[PDB]
Amino acid sequence: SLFNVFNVTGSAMSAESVRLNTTSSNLANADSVSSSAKDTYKARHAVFGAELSDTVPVKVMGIVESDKPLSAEYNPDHPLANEEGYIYKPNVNVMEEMANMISASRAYQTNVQVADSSKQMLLRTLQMGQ
Amino acid sequence: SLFNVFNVTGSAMSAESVRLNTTSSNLANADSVSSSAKDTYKARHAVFGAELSDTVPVKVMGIVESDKPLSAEYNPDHPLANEEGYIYKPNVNVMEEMANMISASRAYQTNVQVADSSKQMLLRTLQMGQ
């Protein structure tokens, strides 16, 4: 029904919000050599997935880390330097985060139009019978 | 018999409702890479039908996936990529989804007017001879 559109579009609104927050944590950790949890932060990605289970909502199935190798930088005098003297920094790519930032915002706003479009159809469907 | 117009207008309301649900799923899954290259989401579209063997109802004959080739993207960083670092994405075109949203909403509300006006003609018929 038209109410299923609200569930489908609403799921995308939450879905694009997850990717926006993941990108925000990527931009804020692009230069963080250290990290609690004994893990040099690596770029995270939200992998969307259609939950077919007509109406196909979108669900986040889990956040996946980047496969790119960490950026090694020779800083011998740093306390975190290894024997060779290289400290490692996250593999966050700025350009893809900016592209993800644009795409997530554009996709978020176009889901609002569909919810608005379905809202008007239900209101007119209610005016029938009056 | 006494409500032939309602069965046709109502069928259009159910038919145009499915097309909006399909549009919502296409826009909500426009960036769902999922996994592999054949389980990837593809734009779905309802098929309308009219059996002209008075009134010809409109019947949806199932959802059909688009034949457009998948949008390929070079990204040898996503862990769900392939040998050549390509992730195939759904063949959803935003411009055609926006047009379907406009066409579905307006056509759906047009049948509301016809169904609402059809009831008025039935009500006036009851006043014949009075």
């Binding site: 992998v47 997935g49 889990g62 | 996994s35 769900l80």
Partner: peptide, 24 residues
């Protein structure tokens, strides 16, 4: 299931299998 390398939001404990993720 789905993605094979999803993360876990629970703090590391090293003793309990994380059930937050779809561990199948």
């Amino acid at each position: 299931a789905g993605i094979p390398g999803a993360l876990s939001n629970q703090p590391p404990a090293d003793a309990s299998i994380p059930q937050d993720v779809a561990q199948m």
